[PDB]
Ligand binder design. Structure first.
Ligand SMILES: [Mg+2]
Ligand SMILES: [Mg+2]
Ligand SMILES: [Mg+2]
Ligand SMILES: [Mg+2]
Ligand SMILES: [Zn+2]
Lengths: 289, 246, 110, 166, 148, 153, 295, 41
């Protein structure tokens, strides 16, 4: 028997840690956690982005139809009258739709003014990638929109997260100016494209066909694929370099493990050069006009 | 070096310690049922008519002398005893006992059912999940007969009341792994039993406790098990030859 | 000679988990067509041999009960018959053992 | 001492939702204080790892080890428990998922040598733990093929990067 | 020890600082006591400097909780969801202010070894070296001992 | 180097091996079927085969008489050997004994055991390993091949 | 009709699945059948099985895995019965293996299964532009060295005969089919649905009609494994993987007054009864000859 | 598929084993006799 309480309490802390490691608890809501104040959180969210939102607009945007339905189900199960205030939550469907529309239009305009040679399908794919579930949900989670979003199922599935994020975008559009909303979109969605490639989000199927169609549009007859350099042909890991010559003028070159893969890479490089989305392009302008 | 094992579990009972008990064992109920009511075989068809069943149920309770004397003895032992108010109380007790068995509320189940009824309803079900619900009652419970057993050695009178209950119940018994075993939870199957309640009259408190569950011999067989069951044959020693019954 | 250093657990595992020291699975296991028990292809069935041994023990016990001495062995052939049987012309003149049990199915008259 | 393998069989799972796949039944069994040796019992336990119950019983029937009969009896008891207590049909649809052997409380005695010298002799005891899972036995893992080796080598070559470059 | 601990590359959350700077500190909760002698520094900091820090940084939600506790603590939760808990047990007001400023300036990432002191996306401007970027091409692409 | 050896080492020496084989042969003659160790039964098979041949030489043969006197320790078996086993083994040339391996002994030694039996004994038949019937698939195909071969000639 | 072979396979599989669904819905509840085990090993065994759901394979699983591995055929109290055919009423079951005293029924079942497998290989080993119609599987006795299957080929394919390379390709296809385990399913249907199931092969329609004529109830037994559906007499083996050795021996073109039919003769042995290399060569050489046994 | 070991004498019948032995012996004798005159083939 060792007389002491510090050791016992420290070992209790260790046992709690071991229990937590053994059986991880399900994620709980930050609002349900003790230290929480919704109005202060809304004010801090407004201030941290150097923006001037409206408190009523933000509260309107941060509520969800699933949350409203859950509250109504609890109301029915408990037997209390909540139709006076619960029915006036003003779901953020309109705000989310306006945010989606404005964000898509602004991104399309930005990409059109930045890369004039990008085709309609390419710019549509870029806009869809920027407004996709993964990118928008990642941005919202890093901006703590998930914590401030009022909705059941604390995981907040990607559709709900995207709806809440675009509702916040629409609230910002209604409160501040369209130019300020465009700057916010540029700062919080275009930056996700830094270091990315065009085809990584476009996912085309026939680079050679797209290249020959683009050359036909640009009044170029046809590209010729020629083997420029290679390193080993009977080896287990051959390396080939295929270049594209238009009127015996090299426009692009691509390496590959096999000849077909090298030719496909060369076609991709030529397409990127034609569209202007090259590694040596101008970096995106982040300034205040 | 001289060390041996200990803790050898053995259950050996002798009559000497059983008879040398300082205090006798206190019993809250009897062992079983003394007089088992044998229902007529035409009850299934009689239940199709309301009055043709109610009139007979009223007549049989009144005509028997044993039931009347048992009811009179119960009334003289404890006042405010009414037969008319009994079936509702029995129905509520049965429903609450089934709900307690669903919720695994052993304390409330012990308060409701008796010591001869609790094991038969807890033993094979303690390791399984039960989803039982009450939907409808085709026929109100009917008090058939009342019996009383008096032991003069201790001066204890135990009164048991038999009530025919025709109920509409939905039962779904799951397995410990979560898979369905017995039946579906949305089928309102109809059952007919005879609940025998027991209440000690000498005891000042005297709570009504369900004691027995009588099923008629001609009752339809229970619903088939979802799984398949293999019945092993007789294990034969090498020097023993098999005999095929015919 | 004494060990120089303690052998580690890795070395011990590599030594005493080698396939040579592991028990090899036997692929000659089959089922007896007669009683359905397990037996090897080159070995007689244990269950059937136990039945035969029990019957032989009973027969020898009765034939030794017939002979009151340890050195009193029959000079002629012997035949064992069960209840409901009679000696034939070819079985006559030999020592006879009579059993109350009926004739087993595996035991042929012959 | 410790007794948790016996209590692992008393866990109750919530009912499965309509549409979820049927969770296979798991039965834990153990035999305590077996006179057999720990490593000798472990050899038999490793022999029947991942095999079907019938094939394990067949191997143990002809196995000449003393603990083979003990393990066969343990397997028979586990199968009987699975058939009777648990809702497990098709008594031959079980496979041994885990089969382990641990040590227990040993007994210490004196083993004489000569010249008045003695050593400590340990009467050993082992515990056998077995887990039976309902369903067909999992397939054995085949050796890696040449195509898979080439794929792994190519992937390792491709995952390279210029270290200490930027 | 690098081999003993984990490692990560130099990364920034949500490409912070590219378009605009966002303070990664989300909330800061102090738990102290009013009668514990160890909570003297926390009490004095709350009396003096917490309001000025709150005015300077409006993007962080500051909570103050007096409670019967022996170890005064400060919990910082960042936008990454990271929670960093520190002890302010028996520290001067200047030390408390320095710790609070350090927590505010931190990005909330894990404090482990950073493999490289730099992080550039697509550093292959004007091309990347390959064994064919400096070897002249022969006429017709013939091998050294290949006859056409 | 044990090249070209036909006798295996048993007992405490040559004389002990001879005595053990003599006891086993006496038991086999007395009971008409015995079970022992597989090696012992395999060694005893040759002596059992030779004993029947010696008995077939006749009762008046002095060499056979003294051989039986030496081997059969129980003297009541010698008349049995000369008047039961020998007369019933007349047309048979070398098919006098049948040896079959039985499962290992239940004792902790787990010895490999065999059973030897004189043919034509008055004991229940052992579970002999019987060949598959001709109605099997492979046997029927072989029967078809045999019929084709017979028809080809 | 402008139908791709894959479309024909899809239509046949869908119709078979619809018929099976109708058969399953025919019984609304799960009835309990008490089945006795009349086998020599374990007499008196009682199985409480589900009506039209449980199978003799499930009974073997209840008994032990040894029965599943060994037993091929089931004798339901009066008749042979395949392992994957659900039981109907209370009865008694006896299991039958390859090495039984009278394995003739199992030999016939294995013969029919091998014939069906060979027909399945042949029907899909030919080019789409050509037409291939399976006629039937002539029941020849086990004494004959090869199982025979009747195929009618396109008119322009009547000149050439498959060579050793083609026979080896057929053998490789059969072995590849064996490699994947495909259970055999037996379904009791009527001629009315069998006609719409086949609907393309005139020989198959004639076979269905002549098989339904002898049955007063107009019941046609259909067998299906994987994506192949065929009509054959009696039950079949439960698993394809039972066939270990398999060879396509030869082909014989028999010409009639109406059409010429290729009779493909093949040889196979199960895993339980595999033979030596020389014995297999001799059996294959015997099977190379013509087999003629129709009535 | 835990297949057991099988030899050529396991699945044969009593009447087929002599037939198999003869069918091997005569085939071997014919093969040996065929090569007895190599210079003329
Ligand atoms: Mg001494
Ligand atoms: Mg030691
Ligand atoms: Mg030591
Ligand atoms: Mg020795
Ligand atoms: Zn047997």
């Amino acid at each position: 028997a060792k007389k002491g309480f510090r050791a016992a309490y420290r070992f209790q802390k260790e046992l709690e840690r071991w229990r937590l490691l053994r059986c991880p608890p399900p994620p709980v809501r930050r609002s349900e956690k003790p230290n929480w104040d919704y109005h202060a959180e809304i004010q801090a969210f407004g201030h941290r982005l150097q923006e001037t939102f409206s408190l009523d607009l933000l509260k309107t945007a941060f509520v969800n139809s699933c949350y409203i339905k859950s509250e109504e189900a609890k109301r029915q199960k408990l037997g209390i009258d909540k139709e006076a205030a619960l029915l006036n939550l003003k779901d953020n469907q309109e705000l989310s739709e306006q945010g989606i529309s404005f964000s898509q239009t602004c991104l399309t305009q930005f990409f059109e003014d930045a890369f004039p040679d990008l085709p309609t399908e390419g710019v549509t794919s870029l806009v869809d990638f920027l407004t996709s579930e993964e990118v928008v949900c990642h941005v919202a989670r890093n901006l703590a929109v998930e914590q401030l979003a009022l909705s059941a199922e604390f995981p907040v599935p990607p559709p709900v997260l995207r709806q809440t994020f675009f509702a916040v975008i629409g609230a910002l559009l209604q409160s501040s100016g369209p130019e300020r909303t465009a700057l916010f979109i540029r700062d919080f969605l275009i930056t996700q494209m830094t270091g990315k490639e065009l085809f990584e989000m476009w996912t085309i199927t026939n680079p050679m066909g797209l290249l020959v169609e683009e050359l036909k549009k640009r009044k170029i007859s046809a590209p010729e694929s020629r083997l420029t350099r290679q390193s080993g042909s009977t080896t287990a890991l051959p390396v080939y370099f295929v270049g594209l010559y238009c009127d015996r003028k090299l426009i692009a070159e691509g390496p590959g493990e096999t000849v077909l893969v090298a030719e496909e890479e060369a076609a991709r490089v030529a397409l990127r050069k034609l569209f202007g989305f090259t590694e040596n392009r101008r970096p995106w302008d982040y300034s205040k006009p | 070096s001289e060390k041996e094992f200990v803790e050898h579990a053995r259950k050996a009972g002798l009559v000497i310690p059983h008879e040398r008990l300082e205090r006798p064992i206190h019993l809250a109920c009897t062992a079983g049922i003394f007089d088992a009511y044998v229902p007529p075989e035409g009850d299934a068809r009689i239940s199709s008519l309301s009055k043709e069943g109610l009139a007979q149920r009223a007549e049989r309770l009144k005509k028997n002398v044993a039931s009347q004397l048992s009811i009179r003895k119960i009334r003289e032992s404890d006042p405010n005893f009414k037969i008319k108010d009994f079936p509702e109380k029995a129905k509520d007790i049965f429903i609450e006992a089934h709900l307690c068995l669903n919720n695994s509320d052993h304390d409330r189940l012990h308060t409701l059912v008796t010591e001869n009824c609790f094991p038969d309803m807890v033993w094979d079900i303690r390791y399984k999940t039960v989803r039982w619900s009450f939907v409808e009652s085709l026929e109100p419970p009917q008090v058939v007969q009342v019996r009383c057993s008096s032991l003069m050695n201790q001066g204890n009178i135990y009164g048991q009341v038999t009530v025919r209950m025709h109920t509409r119940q939905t039962l779904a018994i799951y397995d410990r792994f979560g898979r369905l075993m017995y039946g579906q939870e949305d089928v309102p199957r109809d059952v007919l039993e005879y609940v025998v309640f027991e209440k000690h009259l000498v005891d000042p408190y005297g709570s009504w406790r369900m004691h027995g569950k009588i099923i008629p011999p001609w009752a339809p067989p229970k619903q088939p098990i979802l799984k398949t069951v293999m019945i092993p044959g007789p294990q034969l020693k090498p020097w023993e030859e098999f005999e095929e019954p015919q | 000679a004494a060990p120089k250093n303690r052998r580690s657990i890795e070395v011990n595992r590599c030594r005493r988990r080698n396939p040579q020291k592991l028990i090899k699975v036997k692929n000659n296991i089959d089922v007896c067509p007669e009683c359905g028990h397990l037996k090897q292809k080159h070995i007689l069935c244990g269950y059937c041999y136990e039945k035969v041994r029990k019957e032989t023990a009973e027969i020898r016990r009765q034939m030794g009960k017939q002979e009151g001495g340890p050195f009193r062995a029959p000079t002629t052939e012997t035949v064992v018959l069960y209840s409901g049987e009679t000696p034939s012309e070819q079985d006559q003149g030999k020592r006879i053992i009579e059993r109350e049990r009926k004739r087993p199915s595996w035991f042929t008259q012959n | 001492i410790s007794r948790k393998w016996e209590k692992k069989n008393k866990i109750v799972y919530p009912p499965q939702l309509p549409g979820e796949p049927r969770r296979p039944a798991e039965i834990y069994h153990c035999r305590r204080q077996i006179k057999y040796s720990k490593d000798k019992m472990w050899y038999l336990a490793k022999l029947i790892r991942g095999m079907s119950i019938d094939q394990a019983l067949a191997q143990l029937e002809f196995s000449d080890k003393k603990g083979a009969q003990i393990i066969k009896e343990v397997l028979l008891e586990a199968q009987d428990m699975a058939v009777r207590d648990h809702n497990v049909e098709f008594r031959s649809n079980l496979y041994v998922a885990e089969s382990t052997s641990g040590r227990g409380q040993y007994l210490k005695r004196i083993r004489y040598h000569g010249r008045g010298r003695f050593g400590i002799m340990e009467k050993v005891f082992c515990h056998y733990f077995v887990k039976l899972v309902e369903g067909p036995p999992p397939p054995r893992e085949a050796p890696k093929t040449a195509v898979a080796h080439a794929r792994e080598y190519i992937q390792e070559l491709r995952n390279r990067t210029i270290t200490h470059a930027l | 020890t690098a081999r003993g601990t984990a490692s990560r590359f130099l990364t920034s959350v949500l490409h912070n600082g590219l378009g605009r700077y966002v303070q990664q500190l989300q909330r800061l909760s102090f738990s102290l006591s009013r009668d514990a002698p160890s909570s003297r520094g926390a009490r004095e900091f709350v009396e003096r400097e917490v309001t000025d820090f709150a005015r300077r940084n409006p993007g962080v939600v500051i909570y103050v909780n007096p409670r019967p506790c022996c170890v005064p603590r400060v919990v910082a939760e960042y936008l990454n969801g990271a929670v960093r808990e520190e002890s302010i047990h028996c520290k001067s007001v200047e030390e408390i202010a320095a710790l609070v400023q350090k927590l505010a300036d931190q990005s909330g990432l894990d404090v482990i070894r950073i493999r490289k002191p730099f992080h550039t996306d697509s550093p292959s401007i004007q091309g990347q070296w390959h064994p064919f970027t400096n070897k002249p091409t022969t006429l017709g692409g013939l091998r050294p001992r290949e006859v056409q | 180097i044990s090249h070209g050896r036909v006798f295996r080492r048993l007992g405490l020496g040559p004389e002990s091996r001879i005595h053990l084989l003599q006891n086993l042969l006496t038991g086999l003659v007395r009971h008409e079927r015995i079970e022992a160790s597989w090696a012992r039964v395999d060694e005893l098979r040759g002596y059992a085969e030779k004993l029947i041949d010696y008995g077939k030489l006749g009762d008046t043969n002095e060499r056979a008489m003294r051989m039986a006197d030496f081997w059969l320790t129980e003297k009541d078996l010698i008349p049995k050997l000369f008047q039961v086993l020998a007369p019933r083994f007349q047309g048979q040339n070398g098919g006098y004994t049948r040896m079959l391996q039985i499962p290992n002994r239940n004792e902790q030694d787990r010895a490999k055991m065999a059973v030897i039996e004189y043919k034509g004994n008055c004991l229940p038949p052992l579970p002999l390993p019987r060949r598959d019937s001709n109605l099997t698939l492979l046997n029927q195909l072989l029967q078809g091949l045999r019929q084709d071969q017979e028809a080809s000639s | 009709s402008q139908l791709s072979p894959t479309e024909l396979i899809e239509m046949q599989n869908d119709l078979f699945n619809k018929e099976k669904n109708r058969q399953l819905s025919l019984t609304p509840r799960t009835e309990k059948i008490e089945v006795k085990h009349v086998g020599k090993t374990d007499p008196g065994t009682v199985f409480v099985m589900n009506k039209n759901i449980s199978t003799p394979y499930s009974c073997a699983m209840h008994l032990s895995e040894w029965y599943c591995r060994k037993s091929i055929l089931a004798l339901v109290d009066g008749q042979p019965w395949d392992m994957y055919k659900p039981l109907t009423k209370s009865c008694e079951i006896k299991f039958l293996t390859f090495k039984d005293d009278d394995p003739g029924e199992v030999n016939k079942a294995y013969w029919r299964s091998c014939a069906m497998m060979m027909g399945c290989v042949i029907e899909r080993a030919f080019k789409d532009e050509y037409v291939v119609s399976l006629v039937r599987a002539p029941e020849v006795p086990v004494i004959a060295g090869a199982f025979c299957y009747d195929v009618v080929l396109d008119k322009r394919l009547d000149e050439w005969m498959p060579t050793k390379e083609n026979l080896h390709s057929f053998t490789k296809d059969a072995r590849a089919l064996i490699y994947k385990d495909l259970p055999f399913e037996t379904l009791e249907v009527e001629a009315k649905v069998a006609l719409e199931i086949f609907q393309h092969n005139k020989y198959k329609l004639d076979f269905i009609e002549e098989k339904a004529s002898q049955n007063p109830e107009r019941i046609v037994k259909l067998h299906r494994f994987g994506d192949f559906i065929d009509v054959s007499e009696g039950p079949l083996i439960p698993r394809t993987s039972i066939c270990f050795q398999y060879e396509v021996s030869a082909v014989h073109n028999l010409q009639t007054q109406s059409s010429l039919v290729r009779r493909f003769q093949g040889l196979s042995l199960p895993v339980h009864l595999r033979a030596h290399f020389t014995i297999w060569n001799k059996l294959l050489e015997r099977s190379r000859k013509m087999v003629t046994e129709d009535k | 598929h835990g297949k057991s070991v099988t030899w050529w004498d396991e699945h044969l019948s009593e009447e087929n084993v002599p037939f198999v032995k003869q069918l091997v012996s005569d085939e071997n004798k014919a093969q040996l006799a065929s090569k007895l005159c190599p210079l003329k083939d």
